[PDB]
Symmetry: C3
Subunit: 496 residues, 3 copies
């Protein structure tokens, strides 16, 4: 069970150097950060939207295409169509998603798009529609093209696939893919992916620690955000070093149910009728503004909206793009290309749309109640403090806050455990899929990830987080397109 170096070291080095250089000087890093962010987005952000817009076109090409009816492997599907869907529905709930779900509608209102007056009933009607855009069917649809390529590689070519290059053979020649070309590709990929995993952890953390501080009293400090990234890593090490994963799967489920439960709670207490009317009104907005939004760059007013939200989000999506499609691919053996397009979108969107319309209309009602001053809270304490204030403003606050705490807790564990497996896996040679990798390489990464998060938690602000991501997405833009093209050259000749 080797530790291939061409895919182990370049990551580790690069993450360390940059992570180090950043800890050295925070003030200066932040200046660099803000330089990068603004460049990429203001100069290039349009290419991101066009990416998503193409991928969308081709969800259609898949659905009304020639490979439309093609079956994804001969065998029958090893899941009940309902089990399958629920499996998608249940993947979507991350720690970090609770973060955005809870706050993003606020900024949508605070500083709106399309030159809208803030906190205007108008920027409010439009608030949730923008959620439904950024986490709607429209974005999920883009995944279907790679979800089908990985599906087809997996079963129609019975290919073994661990890293991005291992699919590239047809596009570039077994020569270059086995070579360094594929090694650079697998490295850029990994590095980008690492940052993402970290920034995700960085969102998760303050939610967990602000919760503790709320229930307990323990000041949310940095020496405490890092305390808990180590617990996570320790706790991780223990679970994996004990082959305890059997029970980790059982906790993951406890997580899914808790989150439906919670979402369900926030729904009924906050006022379904409203939520329904608001969700409805919102769908028509989405439907009518969709095209405007798909391509929004606000080039005259130069308000940052598209760049800071869409272009930031689109790019996060471009990163996690492969990790999911691979997952959508496995849970989906033996279905038809079209079966899958219609399924993943219907499924996932159900999940995403519920969340963001529940939490958002909660935190929106809170806004029209003046229960809490969200802006003054963010100002003096930081985003997460506010987020928790919007959960705690709820009836039976203490219990409600226990649910969230646990939820965020067991969720982040899941997350960590997950990043480590996948990371260790793409960095070890001669390892069968479904097999547990070397404990040292595994827990090893979990520390490097947890290290990234604090460095971002340290740098302070969201600008680090989003630069991290926007940067990440830049290589993956072409990685993704590459895999996609690869999948195409190799089905033009074999599928038929």
């Amino acid at each position: 069970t080797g530790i291939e170096p061409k895919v182990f070291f370049p990551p580790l080095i690069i993450v360390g150097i940059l992570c180090w250089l950043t800890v050295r000087d925070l003030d200066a890093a932040n200046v660099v950060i803000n330089a990068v962010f603004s460049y990429v987005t203001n100069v290039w952000g349009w290419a991101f939207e066009w990416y998503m817009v193409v991928m969308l076109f081709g969800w259609f090409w898949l659905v009304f295409g020639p490979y439309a009816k093609k079956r994804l492997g001969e065998e029958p599907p090893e899941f009940s169509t309902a089990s399958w869907i629920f499996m998608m529905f249940a993947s979507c709930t991350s720690a970090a998603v609770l973060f955005w779900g809870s706050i993003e509608i606020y900024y949508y209102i605070s500083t709106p798009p399309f030159g809208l007056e803030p906190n205007s009933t108008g920027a409010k009607e439009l608030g949730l529609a923008y959620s439904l855009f950024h986490w709607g069917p429209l974005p999920w649809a883009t995944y279907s093209f790679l979800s089908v390529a990985f599906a087809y590689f997996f079963f129609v070519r019975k290919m073994e696939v661990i890293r991005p290059s291992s699919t590239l053979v047809p596009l570039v020649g077994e020569k270059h893919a086995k070579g360094l070309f594929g090694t650079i590709v697998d490295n850029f990929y990994l590095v980008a992916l690492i940052f993402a995993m970290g920034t995700s952890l960085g969102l998760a953390t303050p939610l967990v620690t602000e919760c503790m501080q709320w229930l307990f009293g323990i000041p949310h400090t940095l020496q405490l955000d890092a305390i808990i990234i180590t617990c996570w890593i320790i706790l991780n090490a223990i679970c994996v070093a004990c082959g305890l994963q059997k029970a980790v799967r059982i906790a993951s489920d406890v997580r899914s149910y808790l989150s439906f439960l919670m979402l369900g709670w926030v729904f009924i207490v906050s006022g379904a009728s409203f939520i329904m009317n608001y969700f409805t009104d919102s769908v028509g907005m989405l439907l009518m503004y969709l095209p405007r939004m798909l391509f929004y760059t606000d080039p005259i007013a130069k308000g940052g909206f598209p760049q800071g939200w869409t272009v930031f989000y689109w790019a996060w999506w471009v990163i996690y793009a492969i990790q999911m499609s691979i997952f959508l691919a496995r849970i989906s053996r033996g279905r038809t290309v079209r079966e899958l397009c219609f399924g993943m979108v219907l499924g996932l969107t159900a999940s995403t749309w519920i969340l963001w319309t529940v939490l958002g209309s909660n935190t929106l009602l809170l806004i029209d109640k003046n229960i809490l001053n969200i802006p003054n809270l963010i100002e003096q304490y930081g985003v997460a403090r506010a987020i928790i204030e919007t959960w705690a403003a709820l009836p039976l606050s203490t219990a409600t806050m226990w649910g969230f705490f646990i939820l965020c807790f067991i969720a982040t564990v899941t997350l960590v455990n997950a990043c480590s497996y996948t990371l260790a896996m793409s960095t070890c040679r001669e390892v069968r899929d479904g097999e547990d990798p070397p404990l040292l390489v595994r827990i090893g990464w979990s520390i490097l990830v947890g290290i990234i998060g604090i460095v971002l938690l340290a740098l302070g602000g969201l600008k680090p987080i989003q630069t991290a991501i926007i940067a990440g997405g830049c290589p993956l833009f072409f990685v993704n397109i590459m895999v996609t093209l690869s999948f195409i050259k190799d089905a033009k000749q074999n599928w038929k």
Copy 2:
């Protein structure tokens, strides 16, 4: 020729009790009325829109579906494709439609949607588009699914169908349909339908009596609106008690022609060029605002627009839904599922679109002329007074007003004659279709209907009218869905 009691009495009783309870105390009723209206619409109005939205989706499923090419019975179609269409075109003209057609554009402008400044060129450009939405293809389309089910029941299953339950066997078992389940269903149905029939009569009446007052001088009073509901009933009794229906069909035609004639008059005098430019400009609005409107609930501004117009309409549509689909079904034997979807929509919309856009641009021009003060007219006299003032503001006023008067007149007769047949019919056992029912049961209902109308004419305002309807639509929401589902279970196994 029996009088089945399970479908005769529960109606009669319930209509009487409620009608009685309402006459007892008007002030208090109106308080109840306004309570119901606001509850249903503000809490539930969204589910109505979703209803229509689904049914729409499924006009597509019909058109690009599997039953797409299926023929609706083996025999050829007993109508010229042009006769057919004209038959649809000719059905749309009711008394009450003249009412809405004439006034509704005013309120759109007076109090507009989307936070628009009133009487702003802007709320004006959008005025007619909102007509074209509310009576466009989009709403007709929804009927196609039930129009096909009744078509299929009628011919592909050679089933005999008089009341909603008689279709339900497949969904619920011959047991329950024959039973009381189907009896409750047929009762809610009827009761709802009665109220509608009445409120329609309540719209018609003041148009007829305000016309009289204009031509003659006879004060439009309540003791006079009721005089005329009795004439209608008397006149009805005579026509039916004489088997005179042969000539009623001839008068119905005189009606259709008179209304094309009128519409045509108003068109050319008022200024075609404009009407064309306006109609055009309006179509694009409709086309671009369509999605916004489909789902509009105005949940932040809480202006009543969607709830008071759309939700009120939509629900009227859900009531008359079955009565028409059955009619579209019969006039349409031997056509293809798709032949019918494309036809009814094309046909009907032609009819509806012309009307509104004519009467509305008339009454719109009147508005930009300050010929008359519509608002002050409504204030001191009631809506209908204004409506008539917009007809009489026309050239050759007196003749013009004769045309309308007659039109409204012979039209309402038609209406009454119609409600009575249908009502008596769904309330008598062992009666073949196409056959004249018992004169007592027939004329009997015509009095109960005419009774409802005055009670509403009595209660004063539109709020009674729209509550009536919005209430009606509530059961029929599920009745309609039920029939629809029934039609589906039973084609999944028999059509093939």
Copy 3:
């Protein structure tokens, strides 16, 4: 090589009389002009939009229709699919297009549509989108129906076609088409076409002479605009009287390359990033406003926008409609109906969109720089003066202005040479296609065309130009429809 009189004289006479009557009194003509313009557009302009809307529908009927896969002649296509496309791409660049491309975005901002505040960031974001509408795929698409009819006449019926009537046989009987019916048709056609050709020349001219004045110093006067219309005609006469056309084709190419070159220049110097972001943002606008715009008549605010821009442009399109479709038809032998629809649109739009988004974002940036006062320039000197100021505001102004000068120059030559051939051609009997017509009839027309242009250059303003066109478009409305219907009757029976 005869000079058929039925198609030579009525033109010549009519153009002369009207041209004469206009020179007699300019002040009065202009009063007539402005009378016509406002009548046609305000009363009828809607019918133009409807025209374009139908033809669009039927690009779909072609694409998803029955003639979808039909091949346009048996033989294979005598062009490389890339040669083909480039041939379309290369046709679009006229002199007159440089004019509109350069200025039109200004007025879109100066006086905007949809009740927009002028020079508002808002009327600006929407500026270019309106370009993308007026010269987008949407307008090209309308040509495909006639492009296919001429294609089919040419190869599927091996018919010989010189004038509009020669296609009409099936619609009207060889009797009437050979007759005068077809002679009136061919006359209205021609006359309309002449004016267009002229007004095009009238746009070209002041661009050429304002360039001279910029590089040289020679005052742009009227006695100079006419100097150069005679040079063009002289220069024309020489080239054609020498059978020199071999080298004219070579100069035409030099033109295409120069214009790509120029467009490319303006692109990179002005700031691609922006241009990209702006082009993007603009596509979404187009996509979302599309329906509103398709049918815009602004009937309440009665701002002239639709009538003065769309209805004017639409009508220009209705004239050149046949001349192009015939050309698209020839360059396209042996392709499939659908091959063509997808091809012409993709092709042409590529061309048009690039132009107008480059020149317009240049002239837009100039606006937000206050480099030049475009309004005050138009006021004291006339449109063209401004246009040139926006080219000359560019880096390396003098060379830049040489490129444009040459471009406009060799372009207008091409134009003139072209109008003369075609005109002489449709006015001479017994002349094979591909054959050079009589030098007297040829150069003869070039003087009559150049005469029209000055008469317009004389009358001053754009109102003459656009009335010219709008008037032209009126017969061609039905000519076009006629050809189209003819093509239909004759494929219903022969293609199969």
